[PDB]
Amino acid sequence: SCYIYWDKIKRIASRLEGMNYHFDEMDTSGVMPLLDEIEEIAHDSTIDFESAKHILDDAEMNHALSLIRKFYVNLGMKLQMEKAQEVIESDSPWETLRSFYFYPRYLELLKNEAALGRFRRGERAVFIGGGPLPLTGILLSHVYGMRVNVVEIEPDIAELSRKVIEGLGVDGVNVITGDETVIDGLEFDVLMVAALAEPKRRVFRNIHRYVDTETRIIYRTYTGMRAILYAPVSDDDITGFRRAGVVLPSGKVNNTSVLVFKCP
Amino acid sequence: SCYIYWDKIKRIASRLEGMNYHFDEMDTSGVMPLLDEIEEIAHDSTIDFESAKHILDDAEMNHALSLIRKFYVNLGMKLQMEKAQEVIESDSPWETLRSFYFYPRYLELLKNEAALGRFRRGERAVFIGGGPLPLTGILLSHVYGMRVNVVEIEPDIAELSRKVIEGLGVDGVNVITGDETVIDGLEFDVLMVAALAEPKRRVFRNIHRYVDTETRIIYRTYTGMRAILYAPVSDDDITGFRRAGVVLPSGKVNNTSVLVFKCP
Ligand SMILES: N[C@@H](CCC(=O)O)C(=O)O
Ligand SMILES: N[C@@H](CCC(=O)O)C(=O)O
Ligand code: NA
Ligand code: NA
Prior knowledge:
Two copies of one chain form a homodimer.
Chain A: H1 4-19, H2 32-42, H3 49-56, H4 62-89, H5 93-98, H6 103-116, E1 124-128, H7 135-142, E2 147-152, H8 155-168, E3 173-177, E4 190-193, H9 200-210, E5 216-221, E6 241-247, E7 256-262
Parallel strand pairs in A: 1-2, 1-4, 2-3, 4-5
Antiparallel strand pairs in A: 5-7, 6-7
Helix pairs in contact in A: 1-4, 4-8, 6-7
The structure holds glutamic acid (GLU) (2 copies) and sodium ion (2 copies).
């Protein structure tokens, strides 16, 4: 075809490949302009899902797509690690948390998820894939009054997130070190699967093993042009589950949120 | 998976299988309830596009899908034929036209397409694939004040549509007997491609030959669960064009309308 975005994407990828930013080296503040350029294309409302799929599925786009996704994931992770440490050291930990680049979008996302999942105060939530800054975990208690167990696979990352939570004094948010298989030892009303919880198919296979058909499960994915940011969850990934509600994002929110229930 | 809609579809497919009628011979009034059942599923706003695709692409659905499509197309053509002749014989042609099952849906569909295509009074439109009841061509003139040419391949169907237009006393709608290739020698501001214009790949090929890059082209297609009604236009079909706007339907409107321009 002849979409003006094709060349815009290729020019971004050319700069990413050319600079070859290393996780340990990348200056997080210095590459924010690039993140904005990528998000400008991701968040563009005039691009329909058919066209997005046209572009992003093309064999000639594969290399460029892979560069953009790698940069986005690396930059997101680096921002989380930086913010986590800043919160731990801050004279004002909540103020510090609130100035996190993605904080406003997470409020918007979680409000839509809370409606989708009919969250009630006191309910027990598990969040799979906390990372260094377990922001959703934090908000589920601080805004929604839920009792939260966050699951994180990397021991040093899980410990950093404990320190974040302790530095904030958020009520009722615990961190369990391990993979999604630790949910067998937990009792919960709502389960949420982080956009970064991987590998998706194994994750959902394990969830299926341990949950019943009444448990509300929400997962985060990418649809439309926002799929430039990260690979979407596939239908095959959720075998054994039925979709029961979707929230498509608007504004600067990246994720699509999907409610599923386990099939009988 | 375990969608409730799956069993609902199989049930309709078995009622269709149950008929002794051949679909080109069925009584139109007697099968309206089956149409209603199919439309309830197609029009269900709770079914997300990913789930729809899950159900419709499924191997086990191949035959139920083809059967429901064959029924829907045969019914639609029969309703058109019957209505065209009824309008021709009526002492109140406009009243008769307004009683057409899909009439109010077309009012809504065209209103949205008029915004999508930026229609203006006195502009020239070509509609590819009129059939016996050239309702869109009629509305384009009578409501939107456009100067219309309708193209219809079958000589007797084309002649029937001329009689309908005359009976209604609508000015500014001509019918040309021919395929899409007739557009070579016409000057027009917008081209519209009927949902029924076939075969899509050849039709778009020819269009591409005879239009320039500034001409607004709108084609009608099916997305989401509404794909149960008829096969969608593929991206391969539109090679050489870019999408520049999409209207997804709500309510009981079946078609998705897509604005495209030819690529430089
Ligand atoms: N990953 C965070 C959200 C903030 C971020 O994306 O870095 C979470 O666990 O909710
Ligand atoms: N096919 C008609 C509309 C009526 C119908 O769908 O049967 C058209 O060209 O607009
Ligand atoms: Na996190
Ligand atoms: Na028609």
